[PDB]
Design a protein around this ligand. Structure first.
Ligand SMILES: *[C@@H]1O[C@H](CO)[C@@H](O[C@@H]2O[C@H](CO)[C@@H](O[C@@H]3O[C@H](CO)[C@@H](O)[C@H](O)[C@@H]3O)[C@H](O)[C@H]2NC(C)=O)[C@H](O)[C@H]1NC(C)=O
Ligand code: NAG
Lengths: 303, 111, 98, 185
């Protein structure tokens, strides 16, 4: 079918099998009526059709592009065409890449560090240029203007294999003024990937508590007990983490393995005492105490 | 023109067959849903040999890819070549100032 | 009202409790509003006993007549398989042969 | 140390153990958090979602809808002149949440016992903890009467509903625990 992603942009859905007939596509121009409108697809002055209406089935990608509405020597309007390939009845997914870490068919990975509702979503795509992303978000469907997603930005250019995957991320903040203790609706994020004449869309649904990942414990210091082999170690809650620290709580896991396999000890208390071998480091990790959450980065102080 | 087919005719003036030594075994296969690769082998070696993959669509708007001393090229759905309908493909190499042509092969290219 | 079965409802004839030797007509029926989001002749409506396939109908109405059930309980679960999405459990019946 | 906080910590631990048992017992029935939708029975009846917040978080007070279900039942968990209305309404709503769940859990348990085999049955200890917490929350505690049926219900439907309730109840139990920790500190 033909639908408009945005004004002057029309995404066309086409089946993808050999020798496929194309959908009858009709082009219309919202301009004062002109007798003799001409139509071009390429920048070249080759003229495709005459009249305020142009008919052209998009049988292949070559037939999709910026059709130009021009008459009198002035370009009356513009008709960009986008293509959504469907293979065996299944929407194509070529622009982004399947990380697969949570499960198969996962192209969007989101995370948060606070209960404020501020969250960031990372998507890895291997297409170097001609790439644009449209991001929209909402709590369930009931909240209109529920979430204020920011704009995609390239973040990193790592060299996995030789492909050099590039990671693009968005910053989204729940704009709901009313505070609420528990969430009943999952936040939904849609990325409308666009590359050249190809359009793809990806949808991810999640809860803030599930995606929360705490930042590393702050102000870790080691204080040796007087005349004893053991050493007391004291750490503090991260400032970024939501407040008050009583309602929202964290669990600290302390591993002293440094450089016997597992010295990990789980302590709710902000200070624990561990025998310190001279040749090892002591490291601490933070997780949401109440629910299972992604573990924080290790905080290591030399011992 | 950048990693995409150019519809304009190839720069070299004469495509006349040059010598017994010719590119051979031109074959195109689908690496991935949007990745493809064509492999051709030149019988006679040259330090300055340049390889060009010139194809022709069903419309007849023959177009030429640009490559530099490679037996393989990889292109995507939007290079310009049709990846659903029939499309011929052939290889031409300008070595010794003579352009030899690999035998033309027509492949669906979707397989 | 928490509802265990939403996508569709499954009926058993005559009843979940049957005399040893009787044959049950497990019939899985899908409500019209619910269904595969994209119609395709690839999606199926499977019926499984202990996660073992016994039948498959493209249409919303699926009819089965299991026989020679032994003494015990057999869980017949009727899942929906779409074209690319994973199977969604729709509804099921537990039969006690006595 | 807060005695109600100790009961709430006992509640969360009891639900965690029961949830683990439920997943092991019902191998085919789908009871993983991913395959079970979140459905809350107390969605509109109680205002725990809004009333139970830290005093710093709640300010406009506009969102508290017309003192919804503002029974403000007096109880042994707090003292009558000790804390602000925002926590008094919250304690009443938490009592109501536990009453709605206990009445339902007892109904499910009575149906589960009729099963020829004993694949799964609700933990008696977990039900006792819910009653003990309610007694502290409100003096006028009502003990649910023994429930029974004169017929046999379909068991598959009860086992799917059970998994949906257990997961939702566990989220409620953490919410109660956070409020009890805030009251203690
Ligand atoms: C993700 O991509 C798909 C692919 O196009 C989008 O589905 C399409 O959505 C448009 C917009 O609603 C549909 O076009 C119009 O739909 C309305 C409502 O039914 C109708 O009144 C118009 O006449 C026109 O049909 C289009 O039919 C639909 N395609 C299919 C196969 O259902 C989807 O909206 C995209 N989602 C996002 C968040 O971008
Ligand atoms: C089961 O259904 C079939 C067809 O629907 C019918 O012929 C048969 O008599 C039924 N048997 C029982 C025991 O209901």
């Amino acid at each position: 079918a033909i639908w408009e992603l945005k004004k002057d942009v029309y995404v066309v859905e086409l089946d993808w099998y050999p020798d496929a007939p194309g959908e009858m596509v009709v082009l219309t121009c919202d301009t004062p009526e002109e007798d003799g409108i001409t139509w071009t697809l390429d920048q070249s002055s080759e003229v495709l059709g005459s009249g305020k209406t142009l008919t052209i089935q998009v049988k292949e990608f070559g037939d999709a592009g910026q059709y130009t509405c021009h008459k009198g020597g002035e370009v009356l309007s513009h008709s960009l065409l986008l293509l959504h390939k469907k293979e065996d009845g299944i929407w194509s997914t070529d622009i982004l890449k399947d990380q697969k870490e949570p499960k198969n068919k996962t192209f969007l990975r989101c995370e948060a560090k606070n209960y404020s509702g501020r969250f960031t979503c990372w998507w890895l795509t291997t297409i170097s240029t001609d790439l644009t992303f449209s991001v929209k978000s909402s709590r369930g469907s009931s909240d209109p203007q529920g979430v204020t997603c920011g704009a995609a930005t390239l973040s990193a250019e790592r060299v996995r294999g030789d492909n050099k995957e590039y990671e693009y991320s968005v910053e989204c903040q729940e704009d709901s003024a009313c505070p609420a203790a528990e969430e009943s609706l999952p936040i939904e994020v849609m990325v409308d990937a666009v590359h050249k004449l190809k359009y793809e869309n990806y949808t991810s649904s999640f809860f803030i508590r599930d995606i929360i990942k705490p930042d590393p414990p702050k102000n870790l210091q080691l204080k040796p007990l007087k005349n004893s082999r053991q050493v007391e170690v004291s750490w503090e809650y991260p400032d970024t983490w939501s407040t008050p620290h009583s309602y929202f709580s964290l669990t600290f896991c302390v591993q002293v393995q440094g450089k016997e396999k597992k010295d990990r000890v789980f302590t709710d208390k902000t200070s624990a005492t561990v025998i310190c071998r001279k040749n090892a480091s002591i490291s601490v990790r933070a997780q949401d105490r109440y629910y299972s959450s992604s573990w924080s980065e290790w905080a290591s102080v030399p011992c | 023109r950048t990693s995409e087919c150019c519809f304009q005719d190839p720069p070299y003036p004469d495509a006349d067959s040059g010598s017994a030594s010719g590119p051979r075994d031109l074959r195109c296969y689908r690496i991935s849903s949007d990745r493809y690769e064509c492999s051709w082998q030149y019988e006679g070696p040259t330090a300055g040999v340049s390889h060009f993959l010139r194809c022709c669509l069903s419309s007849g708007r023959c177009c030429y890819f640009a490559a530099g001393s490679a037996t393989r090229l990889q292109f995507s759905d939007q290079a310009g070549v049709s990846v659903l309908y029939t499309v011929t493909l052939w290889v031409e190499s300008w070595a010794r100032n003579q352009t030899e042509k690999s035998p033309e092969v027509t492949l669906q290219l979707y397989n | 009202k928490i509802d265990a079965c939403k996508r569709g409802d499954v009926t058993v004839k005559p009843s979940h409790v049957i005399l040893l030797g009787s044959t049950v007509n497990i019939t899985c029926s899908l409500k019209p509003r619910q269904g595969c989001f994209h119609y395709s002749r690839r999606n199926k409506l499977i019926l499984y006993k202990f996660d073992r396939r016994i039948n498959f109908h493209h249409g919303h109405s699926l009819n089965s007549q299991v026989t020679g059930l032994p003494l015990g309980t057999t869980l017949f679960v009727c899942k929906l398989a779409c074209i690319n999405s994973d199977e969604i459990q729709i509804c099921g019946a537990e039969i006690f042969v006595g | 140390m807060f005695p109600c906080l100790h009961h709430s910590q006992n509640l969360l631990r009891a639900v965690s153990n029961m949830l683990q048992k439920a997943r092991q017992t019902l191998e085919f029935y789908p009871c993983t958090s991913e395959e079970i939708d979140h459905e809350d029975i107390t969605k509109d009846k109680t205002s725990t979602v809004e009333a139970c917040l830290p005093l710093e978080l709640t300010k406009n007070e506009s969102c508290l809808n017309s003192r919804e279900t503002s029974f403000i039942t007096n109880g042994s968990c707090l003292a009558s002149r000790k804390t602000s209305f925002m926590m008094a309404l919250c304690l009443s709503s938490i009592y109501e949440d536990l009453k709605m769940y206990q009445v339902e859990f007892k109904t499910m348990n009575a149906k589960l016992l009729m099963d020829p085999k004993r694949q799964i049955f609700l933990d008696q200890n977990m039900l006792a903890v819910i009653d003990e917490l309610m007694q502290a929350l409100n003096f006028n505690s009502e003990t649910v009467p023994q429930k029974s049926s004169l017929e046999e219900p379909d068991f598959y439907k009860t086992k799917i509903k059970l998994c949906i309730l257990l997961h939702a109840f566990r989220i409620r139990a953490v919410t109660i625990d956070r409020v009890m920790s805030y009251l203690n500190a």
